[PDB]
Amino acid sequence: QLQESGGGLVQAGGSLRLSCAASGTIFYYEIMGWYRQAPGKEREFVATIDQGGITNYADSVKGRFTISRDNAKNTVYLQMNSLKPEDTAVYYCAVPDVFVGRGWDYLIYWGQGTQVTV
Amino acid sequence: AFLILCLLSAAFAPICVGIVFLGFTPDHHCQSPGVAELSQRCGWSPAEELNYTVPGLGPAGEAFLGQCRRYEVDWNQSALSCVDPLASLATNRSHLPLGPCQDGWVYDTPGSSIVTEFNLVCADSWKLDLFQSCLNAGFLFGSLGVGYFADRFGRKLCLLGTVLVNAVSGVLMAFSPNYMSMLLFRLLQGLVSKGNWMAGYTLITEFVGSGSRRTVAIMYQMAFTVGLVALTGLAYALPHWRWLQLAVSLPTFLFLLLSPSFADLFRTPRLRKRTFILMYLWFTDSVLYQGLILHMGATSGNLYLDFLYSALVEIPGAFIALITIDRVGRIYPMAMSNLLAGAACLVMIFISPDLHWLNIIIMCVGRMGITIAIQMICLVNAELYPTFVRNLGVMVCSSLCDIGGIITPFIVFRLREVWQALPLILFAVLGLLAAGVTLLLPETKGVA
């Protein structure tokens, strides 16, 4: 079961924090990630993180977004700061499939996400 | 810290590989007293003397007709024609009596080995496999018993003791008077070898942060390759096994101065499939890797150059294994590399009149294909599995490969008697079937 939180309406692209929760079997044995709705586009990719701690990022948000993992509360955090009036979409929490495709193209779990506007 | 660990890995590298140089079998034949007197009397054909003494072994029978048999003709105190002594004595040379070999044979080599010294040919040929079997038995036994010695003493006194025991065992084996003592020392050092080797890896993994684990693993692979390269140089200038053993043993003496549980992988049906497929793939790959080197180091006409060239093509394997990440899925390189190690083995049994310029390239291709597949399993392990579960899986896979290495040498060495191509069919079958089980790893109903 994947559930999201956070969101709101920032005034001038201020800092905001997003949190994704897990059940406990998902949190320890596979790879999490975040995806963006991007209205006018079918789907967008932002960042991932795995058990070792190696992180990936998108070429359009590099140097602005940070993803961190918390083991005590079984949650994955994402921090966005200094936003610009171009990021208005719905953010989903998903579990990609590694063995088939390109490693981040297919999904087997999602949680209906949440909406945030600037 | 990196230099010490790399030196330790390079020093551990020759332990499981040196049997190519220490124990090697040269051409030999039965010796008969008195033939030297006639050769001194008649030196018309010193070279053809063999032709005139060794019986005419036929096809596929040379292993038990010229290396384990002798004629009963009394060469000494007999008048001969100096050209064809056997033709004049008897019209037919296929009817004279034969018998068991004696006087310890005569070898053709400037060096020495265990086979040459202890006469491990003919009916005693099965004693050579004990060398590797005892070492692998030590590897299996030392994995379980290393945990206890990590407690009640400390994590500092173990490394020094293991290093001291390894060095002393190496020297004493270099000074062994009989065969049994050498086996005892091999078994004695087999434990401490892996016991001290694992600690360096663990320390290197722990000390470096999570962002350079791939880099330090590649550095370990480079250190292993470098250690393999230097061993070929020493065996070129030291053709005696005592000298080589002392030379590879003394440096060790000189340089000394809400939780992840293993029971959670078998309850959920989704994690009970890949955790078995990965185990099977690792076992098969370890068996193939161990078998290929021993097969190559038995039927080589140019050992040094072949060994150097095969060891020099293991860096591009790691390079491609690292490059393919993040650009292609995780099962395409796995399937391709597992399929490349079967086709080469199948081809390697169908090229008689193309030697000296094709076997080298085919062996290099097979070695690279095997090397690529091993790295991907380690990367997937580091990506998908937590600490404790993999912290026990490393020991489990070590035990698996240890039992595989216990069973392998007997099958590899003793299946070549029926036919020379028999061990090259099992490898092809394992390789071609291990590429069909990786296609069950993707999860069904993957919505795009």
Tab-separated table of C-alpha atoms in Angstrom, chain B residues 277 280-285 288 331 334-339 341-342 373 426-441:
chain	number	residue	atom	x	y	z
B	277	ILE	CA	16.968	-18.113	-9.715
B	280	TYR	CA	21.083	-21.237	-9.367
B	281	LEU	CA	22.742	-18.765	-11.748
B	282	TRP	CA	25.571	-18.051	-9.298
B	283	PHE	CA	26.237	-21.763	-8.750
B	284	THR	CA	26.309	-22.485	-12.491
B	285	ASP	CA	28.586	-19.523	-13.251
B	288	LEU	CA	31.821	-22.921	-15.324
B	331	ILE	CA	18.341	-9.208	-18.343
B	334	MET	CA	22.698	-11.414	-18.692
B	335	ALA	CA	21.079	-13.521	-21.414
B	336	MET	CA	23.599	-12.448	-24.062
B	337	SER	CA	26.626	-13.159	-21.855
B	338	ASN	CA	25.214	-16.529	-20.787
B	339	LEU	CA	24.570	-17.424	-24.437
B	341	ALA	CA	29.643	-18.936	-23.088
B	342	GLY	CA	27.788	-21.880	-24.646
B	373	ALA	CA	27.799	-12.360	-16.388
B	426	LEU	CA	28.381	-30.483	-20.064
B	427	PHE	CA	29.678	-26.905	-20.184
B	428	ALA	CA	27.685	-26.188	-23.349
B	429	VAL	CA	24.515	-27.693	-21.858
B	430	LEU	CA	24.853	-25.704	-18.628
B	431	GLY	CA	25.549	-22.473	-20.505
B	432	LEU	CA	22.738	-22.906	-23.030
B	433	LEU	CA	20.203	-23.827	-20.339
B	434	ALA	CA	21.227	-21.083	-17.890
B	435	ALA	CA	20.218	-18.497	-20.515
B	436	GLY	CA	16.631	-19.792	-20.588
B	437	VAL	CA	15.870	-19.438	-16.877
B	438	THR	CA	16.581	-15.685	-16.776
B	439	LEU	CA	13.442	-15.052	-18.866
B	440	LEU	CA	11.181	-16.018	-15.934
B	441	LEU	CA	12.495	-13.113	-13.811
